[PDB]
Amino acid sequence: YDGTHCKAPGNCWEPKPGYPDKVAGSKYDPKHDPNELNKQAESIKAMEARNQKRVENYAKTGKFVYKVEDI
């Protein structure tokens, strides 16, 4: 693996000698919990929805309020 043999433009990864093409099912399988993987995107959706509430309240009243329970 010297970085110069490319399967497609922008895609030059190769396994090192003795390592696998794919990790799933290998001794290096990260075995990620799909539920853990999805947590940060769920958290972002929730922040984005709270922020949209703060924006809407500012457009409606002309006064900024951070705490979404106080709107």
Binding site: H32, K39, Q40
Partner: protein
Amino acid sequence: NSELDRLSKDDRNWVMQTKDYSATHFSRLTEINSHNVKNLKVAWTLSTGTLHGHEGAPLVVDGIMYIHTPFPNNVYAVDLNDTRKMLWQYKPKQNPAARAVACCDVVNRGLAYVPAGEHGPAKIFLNQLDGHIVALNAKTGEEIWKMENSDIAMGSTLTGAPFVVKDKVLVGSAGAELGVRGYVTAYNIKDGKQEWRAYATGPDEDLLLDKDFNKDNPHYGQFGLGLSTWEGDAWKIGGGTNWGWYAYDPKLDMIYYGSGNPAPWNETMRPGDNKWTMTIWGRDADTGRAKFGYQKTPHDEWDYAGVNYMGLSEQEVDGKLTPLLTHPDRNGLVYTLNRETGALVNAFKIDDTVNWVKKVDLKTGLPIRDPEYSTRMDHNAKGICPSAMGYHNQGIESYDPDKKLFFMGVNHICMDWEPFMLPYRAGQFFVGATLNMYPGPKGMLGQVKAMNAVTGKMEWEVPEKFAVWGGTLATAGDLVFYGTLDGFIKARDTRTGELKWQFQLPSGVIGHPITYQHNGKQYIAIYSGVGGWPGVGLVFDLKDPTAGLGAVGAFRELAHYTQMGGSVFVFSL
């Protein structure tokens, strides 16, 4: 923002961390110069009221200096006609649990500013460690709006400064050491409304790509790569946070920045190029759509987090005057690209000891890897240069357009590295490597260098006892000023590197110097307060050489020279 751009051209001001949208860090002031800087004295000082690392530096606009701290990221304003009084203060209330998800000290790279405003009054912007973007009235300190960008429960913080472009303020990301998938966000300065958000990995709609993305250099890669260069869903936790600096070309209406390292550090857990971590981006300002993207470090094996500054200049390339960006990466290469097309102009080694890469082939754009300095499971890789701290880190550097030279504070640090398997759990660290660091082959930990970024020609090079971390300020006085981790501010002649002045500050420096004119006199200002990644051993009383992600062993002598601190020093003749 055209009015911010105009204010940046006035030597009474220092309106953004990078000084101006080109990140020149160059002042045309000459009152202080190579022939009288030996007579520079302390004029006045301020205490910040906190310890920990003090990154970035003050802003100065319209006769007011603005200061910021590490966590809890207090802000204050000082009228330069009454330097003893604080005009206003803002003191955030933040969950102290924010501190526990910061890998390398609770540093904050500083404030941004926008002038008044259809939007309306002039504002100061602060990114808090706890993930909030805050807009304050620049004259009164009143909180105008505050939005949630990042969630500390996911290990996601903010440490990079906000960046103002037209009617938007851009907010980065941080937490790649905790599996945070990187994203940059534009908010409207009037009401805090999110305008656009561009992720560093994953599907093309998340990356926010122009239909003509990489039209000029299709060999960089175009569509589908934020999925196809990862195995399965590993991109969801895949790093690429942007915690460094930006530049902006108003004529092209393009913003430039670097995305950070892929997660975890254990390369074996994430086969593939890992795009678009480690990438130099050119995005349209209004839409956030990338017009180009160059991946410097495919499939990172070394945490060469690609977040360092972007310095714009206009220089001859084969006799034709060309708009450029120059970018000294952690990986030890100095990249210069055409900032309109994204074409590679040069990529040279910042020090000849860089060994992970033999060279970058400029036609293919690919770094030719040396497998002797790769990292991989079940191997302790020895002697890799640079270390994960980089041969260059978060310091903003400087450009003298008359000499066509960049001046850079450089690190000389190498490492051994061995990965380990570990699970991802949101909110927990997700590193998976054990490191030992030490001086590079020349034997010291720092250097200051002057270079031409088109030719790669080094004008001069000088050693420093420790890594020079906080960046540089250059002036038409033929001087480059910088701070050192051991607690000096120094000035060197830009033609030769000769040391012309030094002053013993209370604590080490991890930010940059600034200069400004007030009431017809030139001042130089800097923070003193050691910390950040090199200071982690002394800030947290760590003793295991592999702690602080390998920084503790390399920097174990630093606590012999400095304590923590928190102060602003202002110098004049």
